Amino acid sequence: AIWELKKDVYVVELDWYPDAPGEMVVLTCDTPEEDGITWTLDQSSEVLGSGKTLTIQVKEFGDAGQYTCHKGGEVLSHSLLLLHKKEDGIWSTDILKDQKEPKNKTFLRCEAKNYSGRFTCWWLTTISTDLTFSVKSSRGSSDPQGVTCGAATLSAERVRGDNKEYEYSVECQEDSACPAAEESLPIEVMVDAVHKLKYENYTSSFFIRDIIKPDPPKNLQLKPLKNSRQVEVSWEYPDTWSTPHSYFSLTFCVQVQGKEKKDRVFTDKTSATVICRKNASISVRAQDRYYSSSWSEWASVPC
Amino acid sequence: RTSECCFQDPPYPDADSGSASGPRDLRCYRISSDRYECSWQYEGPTAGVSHFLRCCLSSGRCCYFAAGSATRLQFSDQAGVSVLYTVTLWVESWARNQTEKSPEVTLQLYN
Amino acid sequence: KIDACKRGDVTVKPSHVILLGSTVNITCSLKPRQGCFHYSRRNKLILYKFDRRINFHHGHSLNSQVTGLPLGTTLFVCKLACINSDEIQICGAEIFVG
Amino acid sequence: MFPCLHHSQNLLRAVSNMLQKARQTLEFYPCTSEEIDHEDITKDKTSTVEACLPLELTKNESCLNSRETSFITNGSCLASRKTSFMMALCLSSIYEDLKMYQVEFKTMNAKLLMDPKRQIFLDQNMLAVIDELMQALNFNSETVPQKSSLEEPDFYKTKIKLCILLHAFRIRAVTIDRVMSYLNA
Ligand SMILES: *[C@@H]1O[C@H](CO)[C@@H](O[C@@H]2O[C@H](CO)[C@@H](O[C@@H]3O[C@H](CO)[C@@H](O)[C@H](O)[C@@H]3O)[C@H](O)[C@H]2NC(C)=O)[C@H](O)[C@H]1NC(C)=O
Ligand SMILES: *[C@@H]1O[C@H](CO)[C@@H](O)[C@H](O)[C@H]1NC(C)=O
């Protein structure tokens, strides 16, 4: 079918099998009526059709592009065409890449560090240029203007294999003024990937508590007990983490393995005492105490 | 023109067959849903040999890819070549100032 | 009202409790509003006993007549398989042969 | 140390153990958090979602809808002149949440016992903890009467509903625990 992603942009859905007939596509121009409108697809002055209406089935990608509405020597309007390939009845997914870490068919990975509702979503795509992303978000469907997603930005250019995957991320903040203790609706994020004449869309649904990942414990210091082999170690809650620290709580896991396999000890208390071998480091990790959450980065102080 | 087919005719003036030594075994296969690769082998070696993959669509708007001393090229759905309908493909190499042509092969290219 | 079965409802004839030797007509029926989001002749409506396939109908109405059930309980679960999405459990019946 | 906080910590631990048992017992029935939708029975009846917040978080007070279900039942968990209305309404709503769940859990348990085999049955200890917490929350505690049926219900439907309730109840139990920790500190 033909639908408009945005004004002057029309995404066309086409089946993808050999020798496929194309959908009858009709082009219309919202301009004062002109007798003799001409139509071009390429920048070249080759003229495709005459009249305020142009008919052209998009049988292949070559037939999709910026059709130009021009008459009198002035370009009356513009008709960009986008293509959504469907293979065996299944929407194509070529622009982004399947990380697969949570499960198969996962192209969007989101995370948060606070209960404020501020969250960031990372998507890895291997297409170097001609790439644009449209991001929209909402709590369930009931909240209109529920979430204020920011704009995609390239973040990193790592060299996995030789492909050099590039990671693009968005910053989204729940704009709901009313505070609420528990969430009943999952936040939904849609990325409308666009590359050249190809359009793809990806949808991810999640809860803030599930995606929360705490930042590393702050102000870790080691204080040796007087005349004893053991050493007391004291750490503090991260400032970024939501407040008050009583309602929202964290669990600290302390591993002293440094450089016997597992010295990990789980302590709710902000200070624990561990025998310190001279040749090892002591490291601490933070997780949401109440629910299972992604573990924080290790905080290591030399011992 | 950048990693995409150019519809304009190839720069070299004469495509006349040059010598017994010719590119051979031109074959195109689908690496991935949007990745493809064509492999051709030149019988006679040259330090300055340049390889060009010139194809022709069903419309007849023959177009030429640009490559530099490679037996393989990889292109995507939007290079310009049709990846659903029939499309011929052939290889031409300008070595010794003579352009030899690999035998033309027509492949669906979707397989 | 928490509802265990939403996508569709499954009926058993005559009843979940049957005399040893009787044959049950497990019939899985899908409500019209619910269904595969994209119609395709690839999606199926499977019926499984202990996660073992016994039948498959493209249409919303699926009819089965299991026989020679032994003494015990057999869980017949009727899942929906779409074209690319994973199977969604729709509804099921537990039969006690006595 | 807060005695109600100790009961709430006992509640969360009891639900965690029961949830683990439920997943092991019902191998085919789908009871993983991913395959079970979140459905809350107390969605509109109680205002725990809004009333139970830290005093710093709640300010406009506009969102508290017309003192919804503002029974403000007096109880042994707090003292009558000790804390602000925002926590008094919250304690009443938490009592109501536990009453709605206990009445339902007892109904499910009575149906589960009729099963020829004993694949799964609700933990008696977990039900006792819910009653003990309610007694502290409100003096006028009502003990649910023994429930029974004169017929046999379909068991598959009860086992799917059970998994949906257990997961939702566990989220409620953490919410109660956070409020009890805030009251203690
Ligand atoms: C993700 O991509 C798909 C692919 O196009 C989008 O589905 C399409 O959505 C448009 C917009 O609603 C549909 O076009 C119009 O739909 C309305 C409502 O039914 C109708 O009144 C118009 O006449 C026109 O049909 C289009 O039919 C639909 N395609 C299919 C196969 O259902 C989807 O909206 C995209 N989602 C996002 C968040 O971008
Ligand atoms: C089961 O259904 C079939 C067809 O629907 C019918 O012929 C048969 O008599 C039924 N048997 C029982 C025991 O209901």
Query: Domain segments of chain C: what residues?
Result: 8-97
Please tell me the number of the ligand nearest to residue A199's CA.
1
Residue B88 lies in a domain: yes
Residue B36 lies in a domain: yes
Ligand 2 atom with the shortest distance to the CA of C65: 1
Counting beta carbons within 10 angstroms of the beta carbon of residue B29, is it exposed (0 to 12), middle (13 to 18) or buried (19 or more)? exposed
Residue B14 lies in a domain: no
Q: Where are the alpha helices (DSSP H) in chain D?
A: 3-25, 48-51, 85-113, 124-137, 155-184
What superfamily would CATH give domain A93-211?
Immunoglobulins (2.60.40.10)
- Give whole-number Cα distances, B100 to A108, A208, B28, B69, in Å: 49, 64, 19, 14
3-state secondary structure chain A: CEEEEECCEEEEEEECCCCCCCCCCEEECCCCCCCCCEEECCCCCCCCEECCEEECCCCCHHHCCEEEEEECCEEEEEEEEEEEEEECCEECCCCECCCCCCCCCCCCEEEECCCCCEEEEEEEECCCCCEECCEEEEECCCCCCCECCCCCEEEEECCCCCCCCEEEEEEEEECCCCCCCCCCCCEEEEECCEECCEECCEEEEECHHHHECCCCCEEEEEEECCCCCEEEEEEECCCCCCCCCCCCCEEEEEECCCCCCCCCEEECCCEEEEECCCCCEEEEEEEECCCCCCCCCCEEEEC
Cβ(C13) to ligand 2 under 6 A?
A: yes
Cβ(C31) to ligand 2 under 6 A?
A: no
Taking a C-beta distance cutoff of 8 angstroms, is the pair C52, C93 a contact?
no
**Domain extents for chain A?**
2-89, 93-211, 218-302
CATH fold label, C8-97: Immunoglobulin-like (2.60.40)
Look-up: residue for tokens 């439907």?
D157
Residue B54 lies in a domain: yes
Its domain, for residue B41, covers 23-107
CA D86, CA D93: separation in Å to the nearest integer? 11
Instruction: Classify residue C70 by its DSSP letter.
Output: P
Resolution in A: 3.6
Nearest CA to ligand 1 atom 36: A201
Q: How far is D129 from chain A (nearest CA, A)?
A: 19
Mutate to test the interface with B, among A58, A63, A83, A94 (most CBs of B within 10 A): A94
Please tell me the number of the ligand nearest to residue A85's CA.
1
For residues A248-286, b (16+ Cβ closer than 10 Å) or e, as one string?
bbbbbbbbbeeeeeebeeebeeeebbbebeeebbbbbbb
CATH fold label, A2-89: Immunoglobulin-like (2.60.40)
For D135, the token pair is 């007694």
Look-up: residue for tokens 């009251």?
D183
CATH fold label, A218-302: Immunoglobulin-like (2.60.40)
CATH of the domain at B102: 2.60.40.10
Helices and strands (DSSP H and E) totals, chain B: 0, 8
Mutate to test the interface with A, among C37, C44, C82, C84 (most CBs of A within 10 A): C84
Same fold, A2-89 and A218-302: yes
Nearest CA to ligand 2 atom 1: C25
Query: Number of structural domains, chain B?
Result: 1
Please tell me whether residue D102 adopts helix, strand or coil conformation.
Answer: helix
Instruction: Please name which of D2, D17, D1 lies closest in space to residue D125, comparing C-alpha atoms.
Output: D17
Residues pairing with A91 in the sheet: A86
Which residues approach ligand 1 with their CB closer than 6 A? A 1, 3, 11, 13, 84, 190, 192, 201
By Cβ distance, the residue of A19, A87, A92 closest to B85 is: A19
**Domain extents for chain D?**
7-43+97-184
By Cβ distance, the residue of D40, D52, D185 closest to A246 is: D185
Please tell me the number of the ligand nearest to residue C65's CA.
2
Ligand 1 atom with the shortest distance to the CA of A190: 38
Residue B12 lies in a domain: no
